[PDB]
């Protein structure tokens, strides 16, 4: 299930970032945002494939929830900017969340579902 | 030197050969010992290398179709190398079958509508389905080799035909389709970009999935029914439902291992079945 | 005994099309690729593609993919390459290689140039 | 496209003398190396195949060495008939990449 | 080099005179019937079943020409009539029912590389044209659908020395039809062919055939060479089978 799950994931994130940067009214806005955090913190969960034979204390592991603490973090501020229905800087906001993705936390997911795949 | 060519000789193989090629010899003869109680390892050797040289013949014809893009061993291939190997193990194979009818008691007619019927009825219809089709027509095949490998070996070894082994052969081919599909999922996006179809690429993933599991999981049933039906003994092969359940929660190595111990308890399953407790046994 | 005997050169004007010929002769043809090699003035080898003389399936070079299209000939036993938009980076020999006989051999069998001048 | 180099670019040496190349890769490429020689107006002809492996019709003073990154050609003893431009190609990943090229002086 | 000669030959003298050739062979087969009417209601149920098939399973009118389809209709009636025709008068009346799976399958598979050699003679322009590229047709298509029906013979026929009736009733059903297949396709298929398109110039398939057809044509070099070992193997066990068994 976990290879499967972290597509789906994956993918409905990519697809809520399509519904955000092509969103109109707030309320869509603000539901498709609480659903990127609730696929964020089931992510979280979700351990890197990369680091299954190191200890879940290691610096890697570290830079990866410092990562997230910085996703939610940026969620967390466009929910609180949008709750009153400021949309431009929310998608402002969003596109940064999409630099920063790319930066770190598309480069190690991706990657990190290739091995588990390569297990099975 | 060998270790030099070792390397163009494992071009010929694929993570489903050995459970796909070797454990219905192994099996057939099992068979073969429950039935009549003698057992012959000349002609276990030759049935074998027979069945492994066919189906490496086979997996070249398929390798041949990577010449169409660089798909591409620690050296220069070109397509010569490739004829040359499919030409000679097959000559192998066909040496060998004619060694195992010298040696065999089976009448040459039967030897050869299974030999040139079952075994090497790939050839007739593969080559010439184009390149993009060749995962699509390996399902038909891993169908009809499992079971034709095992009745092989069974008619070489007793010295007469019979039904019961395909019967008994169900499981081994579910459990080698469910390699050759993990590794067709495995790699779904790459042929997708490369022009290559699969069954996993036509279903899409959730029905792959669900596919997965089924082919997975139908073995188990089958050996449920079989221990608690024929004989009890047979029940070995539940004993590795753990791994199985592994194997689901991570979703073509593990499968690999896993289809080899299936077939392993499966083969010590039926040897200490008891005698006249198995059907047309 | 294996030869690649190669056409002659070719004085040709700037934007035209050119067409070179490497008769193969003295082993079975369509069992081994046609390797092309371009070899610039410096004396600096570049390696253009590969034809499969039994189908024709060509694989390039990324930077020859546009402006170099091999094709054969199995009849005759000749291998083409036809060069298109020529400019003035084009005057160069060019090379038709295959590899040695037996397997694990390197490219043994080189043809002679053809100096193609823009 | 990996890149290899060489370091003579003009190498001067005398009759007798050892001579000594290197093809320096920018990756790890096995034992997948092949070292050229190209005379004055000619075809280049294969001389080490894969880094080590000699080549029947040519004479023992050329041998190889050399694994994973770092590459070596050697000379026993230089004549009148060792004076031309050495490529060295790697055959591991395509596209193949020839070297620069070393030129050789009496 | 040496056999594309003489099935270049073969097909241009087949091509060159059409009407000899076909009613001297429609008169062999009707000889070889009467010498020793339901031919013709088992000829035309078979073939509006096989060509309904065909003419599904393939995409109707994906080129935008009809020719094809009335040549692999012409090719059909004549190798269900030839085969027909043997089931009924010589072999076995009564036994020919349920058991036509194979037959029915094996011309299925026989039509694409006689709608092959239709595409081949529709990209001409002129008489002698067409009559050279039914001619180059012949050639390129000649040994390769030779070898394939020698094999599947063979095959199929050492299933004929089995001992269990059924399957020996039925690889000999397999026998006759590639055999009808490959004789309907070398001696009347071409004048046919070539008949068919002189008698009626808006046949326009000339670019793709002529990139394609000696690429995309070529079967797998292990797989013939597979074959010929398979072919030489079988006619062993049949020689030894059939005179010193
Ligand atoms: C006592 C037993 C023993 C065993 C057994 O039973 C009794 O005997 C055997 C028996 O003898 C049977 C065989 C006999 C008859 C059959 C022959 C058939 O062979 C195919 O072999 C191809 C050889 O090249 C030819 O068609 C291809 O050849 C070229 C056409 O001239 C194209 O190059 C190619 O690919 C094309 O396909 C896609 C595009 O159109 C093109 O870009 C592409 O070039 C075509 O492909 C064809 O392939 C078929 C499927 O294989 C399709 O139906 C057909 O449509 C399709 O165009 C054509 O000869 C045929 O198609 C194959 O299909 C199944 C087959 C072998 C049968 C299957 C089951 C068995 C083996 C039976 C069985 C185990
Ligand atoms: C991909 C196809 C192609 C080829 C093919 O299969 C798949 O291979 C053959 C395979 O081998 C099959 C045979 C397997 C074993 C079977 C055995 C049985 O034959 C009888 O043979 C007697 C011999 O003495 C026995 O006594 C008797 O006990 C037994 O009953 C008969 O009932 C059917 C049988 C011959 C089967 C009929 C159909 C096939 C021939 C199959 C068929 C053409
Ligand atoms: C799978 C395909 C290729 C079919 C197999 C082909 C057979 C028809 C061939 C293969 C080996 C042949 C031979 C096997 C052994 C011999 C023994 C020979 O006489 C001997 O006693 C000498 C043997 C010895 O002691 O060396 C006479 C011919 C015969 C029966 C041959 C009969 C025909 C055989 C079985
Ligand atoms: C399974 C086997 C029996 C089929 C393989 C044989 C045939 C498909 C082909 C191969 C070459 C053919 C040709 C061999 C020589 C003759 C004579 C030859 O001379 C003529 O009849 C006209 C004079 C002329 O050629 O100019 C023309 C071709 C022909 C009819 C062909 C007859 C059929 C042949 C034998
Ligand atoms: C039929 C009886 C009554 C007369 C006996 C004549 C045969 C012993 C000979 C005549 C011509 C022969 C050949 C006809 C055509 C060839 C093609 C030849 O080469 C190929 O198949 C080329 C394949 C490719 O190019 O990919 C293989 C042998 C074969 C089938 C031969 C089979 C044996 C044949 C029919
Ligand atoms: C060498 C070349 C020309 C390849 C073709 C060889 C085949 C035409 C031969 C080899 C053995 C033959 C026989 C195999 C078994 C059948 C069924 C058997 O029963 C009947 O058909 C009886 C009714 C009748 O008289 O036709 C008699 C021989 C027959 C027709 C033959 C069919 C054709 C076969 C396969
Ligand atoms: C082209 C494809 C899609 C369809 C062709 C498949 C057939 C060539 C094969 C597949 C399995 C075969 C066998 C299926 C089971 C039966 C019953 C079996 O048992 C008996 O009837 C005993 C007879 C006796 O020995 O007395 C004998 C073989 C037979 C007739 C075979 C008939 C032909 C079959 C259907
Ligand atoms: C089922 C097996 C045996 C397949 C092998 C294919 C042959 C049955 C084919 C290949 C060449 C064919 C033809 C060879 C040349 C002629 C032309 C034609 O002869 C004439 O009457 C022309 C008279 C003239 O012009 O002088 C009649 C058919 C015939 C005998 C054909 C008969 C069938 C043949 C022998």
Redesign the interface.
Known sequence: ARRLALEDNWETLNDNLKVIEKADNAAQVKDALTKMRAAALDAQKATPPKLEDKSPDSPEMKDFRHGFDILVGQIDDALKLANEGKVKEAQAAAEQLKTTRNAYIQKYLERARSTLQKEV | SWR??CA?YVLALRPWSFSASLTPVALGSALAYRSQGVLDPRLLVGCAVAVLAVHGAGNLVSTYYD????IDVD???????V?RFGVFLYTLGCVCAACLYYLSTLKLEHLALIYFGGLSGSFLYTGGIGFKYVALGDLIILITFGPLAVMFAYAVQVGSLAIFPLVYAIPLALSTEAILHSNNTRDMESDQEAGIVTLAILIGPTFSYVLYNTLLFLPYLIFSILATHCSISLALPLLTIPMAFSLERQFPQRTAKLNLLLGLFYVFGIILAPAGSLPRL | EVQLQQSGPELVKPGASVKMSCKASGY?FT???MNWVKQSHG?????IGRI?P????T?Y???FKGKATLTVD?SSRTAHMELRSLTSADSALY?CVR?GED??????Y????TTVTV | DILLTQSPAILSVSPGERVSFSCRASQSIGTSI?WYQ?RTNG????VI??ASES?SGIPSRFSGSGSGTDFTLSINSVESEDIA?Y?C?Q?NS?????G??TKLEI | DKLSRLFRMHGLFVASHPWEVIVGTVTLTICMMSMNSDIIILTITRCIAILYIYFQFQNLRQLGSRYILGIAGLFTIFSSFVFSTVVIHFLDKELTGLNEALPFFLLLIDLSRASALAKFALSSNSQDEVRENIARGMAILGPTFTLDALVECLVIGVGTMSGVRQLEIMCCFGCMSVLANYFVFMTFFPACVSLVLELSPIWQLSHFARVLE??EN?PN?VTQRVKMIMSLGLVLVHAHSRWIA
């Open positions: 030099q060519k163009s010449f169409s893009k660089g050296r220069i291939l070109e397509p010569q190398d004829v | 079975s069992g081994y690729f004396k600096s080898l570049e390696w499969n039994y189908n024709g399936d694989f070079n990324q930077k199995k090379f590899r397997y694990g051999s390197s490219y043994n080189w043809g002679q140039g | 092949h190209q075809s280049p002809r294969l195949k894969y080549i431009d490529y190609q055959s395509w596209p193949y990449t020839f620069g090229g | 000696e690429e070529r070099p």
